[PDB]
Amino acid sequence: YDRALSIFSPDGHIFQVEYALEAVKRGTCAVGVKGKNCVVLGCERRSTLKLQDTRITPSKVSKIDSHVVLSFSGLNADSRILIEKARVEAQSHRLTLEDPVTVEYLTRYVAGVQQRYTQSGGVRPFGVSTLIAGFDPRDDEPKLYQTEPSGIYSSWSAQTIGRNSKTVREFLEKNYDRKEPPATVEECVKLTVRSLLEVVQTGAKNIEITVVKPDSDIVALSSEEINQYVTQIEQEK
Template structure:
């Protein structure tokens, strides 16, 4: 005797339709979109195609790929609004702007990543607190701003691709290659059904194999990637980027690059060294995380420099004011003694 076969979805759908009366064909007044009480988990694709009016507009849209009437475009995935926006991508970019700040700066033979980190809670175990800086391969590192959970998934995908490339080609990935891969993953999640875009931007840095030229790239939730000399992502990134534009110089050495990175972060970080982490990449070397005591010394040096500059400006303004008082129009210096 042949083994019994489980009924297919189409057969189950036919059995369900046979056990219920056919849909009414009497015209009904248009009262707006009607939502069915049937649970979406009980729906079959043939039911949606044959009797779409009996089910929710969202279920019809997800099953058929057609935008059902009554669903806001902001609630759909990978659908353009009438004015050409993909709102889910724009919402993902807003999530990036709400994330902590991350900065990348290239020097002559070094590239530095600096990130703002949130303060740990009193009972939190700081040993397993996720960092904003992650190593993709021995020569490639990225920092991110946005949702930590999204970053964890994207970093795992990038690491897997880097190891697969190493096993297949027997050569490490270039920084541009892994950046393209990360941007490609982000882009695919903007045009696929049933998923949402990654709510993160990344700064990818490192050195290509047998090359001493520092690399710095940025990726965005939309899938765009670009190369930079210095850049910032996350909250107040515009302010930090303007600071970098004013102070960045070509061919900076290691100390100057580290100092500029920390100084730019201090534009938005008000709590000092305890909320800053710094990673340094050099040719032929793995990632170097700057110890907290060294970050503290850099912060103290920068604050002392700022105080000295403020004192000089104050002294200069004071001398100018005194000279203006002693020198008056028509009388010259010492005119007050002749009054």
């Protein structure tokens, strides 16, 4: 094939990018807040449909390395195409220059993939938007980036993407303070959980939280831990 499927618009755009942005909104919702020493990406997980497994059904947040986690919102099918490249580039980094990836670098590469599919003949661009997070190796500053279909990436102190991202981000302007992150890791879990129960609702059976602490600690919380934070917050409120 060789025909353009991305073409210039008489306005100033490409219609496939605006369209792709519309695609991220019709997806499920992932939230990002970083603490003083943690990233937390939590995601809304479906359960309209029932008899769905929990062990074998893939999660919304897929560990690339031992220190770089990626979450995605938009088409759940497409997602796996951006991640397959992203994992192999991380092993190539280890090979050719040594040291594992820096979060800034992986975000720039992932951006370059979506960038390319906005301008190469015979592709549409990805309808999928990432929160790519993690730690730099031998450092402990939390890093939280979000890249989007344009092929543009932005760093964010806290961010949210997917359905009702404007509604959630409004919440986060009013409770997360740029100057003083949540004082500990635990305060940071209560913030991501506090945000989700606005839009997601319908029990703690939908809320997923992955927490990363520096020095290669990836833990994904159990349904019991989630219930516990939702309950506290419901009651206090």
